[PDB]
């Protein structure tokens, strides 16, 4: 809406909110990020450190598809199952343990943040962190590595 704008409240005031001394000119400081090492250096080096220069090695034809590895933590493993599976298996001793294939859920690694209940469970995953698998083992579960 233009009927609740500030150009509707400066009708009558000469300079239109930009001052009489300094005025509103086209580009008194340059266009864009120009001058970030000469006269915008105070802004750049205070609010955007690291902006200039090279870091690290240079990689050609990077493709994110072979690097795709979203991660899941331990406390979200049981949430990855349907509610019927959870009600069937949590807290009840069964000779068969549930299988949680994290690849189907869309993850490439099981991380170790959080805790697990005292029910054995099979975790099918591509990767697993060191103490994530230790927690699963100590909770009674097992980690089966898939391709």
């Amino acid at each position: 809406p233009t009927h609740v704008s500030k150009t509707r409240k400066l009708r009558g005031h000469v300079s239109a909110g930009h001052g009489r001394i300094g005025k509103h000119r086209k580009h008194p400081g340059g266009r864009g990020k120009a001058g970030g090492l000469q006269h915008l250096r105070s802004h750049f080096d205070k609010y955007h450190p690291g902006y200039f220069g090279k870091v690290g090695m240079r990689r050609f034809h990077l493709m994110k598809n072979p690097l795709w590895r979203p991660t899941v933590n331990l406390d979200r493993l049981w949430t990855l199952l349907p509610n019927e599976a959870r009600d069937k298996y949590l807290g009840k001793n069964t000779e068969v343990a549930p299988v949680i294939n994290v690849l189907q859920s869309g993850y490439g690694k099981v991380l170790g943040k959080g805790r697990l209940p005292e029910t054995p469970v099979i975790v099918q995953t591509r990767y697993v962190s060191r103490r994530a698998e230790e927690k699963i083992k100590q909770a009674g579960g097992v980690v089966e590595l898939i391709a």
Binding site: H48, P49, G50
Partner: protein, 186 residues
Amino acid sequence: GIDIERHHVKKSQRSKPASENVYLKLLVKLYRFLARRTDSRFNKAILKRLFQSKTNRPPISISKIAALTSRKSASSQNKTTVVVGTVTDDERMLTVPKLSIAALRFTKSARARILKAGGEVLTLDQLALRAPTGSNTVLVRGKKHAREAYRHFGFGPHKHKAPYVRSEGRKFERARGRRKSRAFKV
């Protein structure tokens, strides 16, 4: 004339919600009466928190309510929990305890999990009848400074705050002023 330091010092308060929600206006009317006609400092707090904005009323979760209500030393286990705001769900907690929570809004998952676990969900007006003076109530708040903006607020030299970068990566504000090898580290 008079030598006065400051002139017409308006308070930084809100006298009414900026929301147009008619039901929120009704809750404001009820709690304005309760605060005005009772000495309940609780009712004054609820009226103040009804006026507050969205960012000043962050969500709280089922687990956080469970954590704050099941402390060892505190015996505030059966007391009704009060939040002026939403009560989101925490799926990371596989088993939900029995909780009696009154809040403005409940997410569908949180409300279903509470009622399935055996507790109850109340509105602020319903708690205005069960505990009109707020006796035996645990008034709690969400972590207000958990927003993304507070990652950046106060940015400057040696403040360890997040910058506004269009893309997190290696070629994006990591060299001059971010490592001692490139001139200086700030």
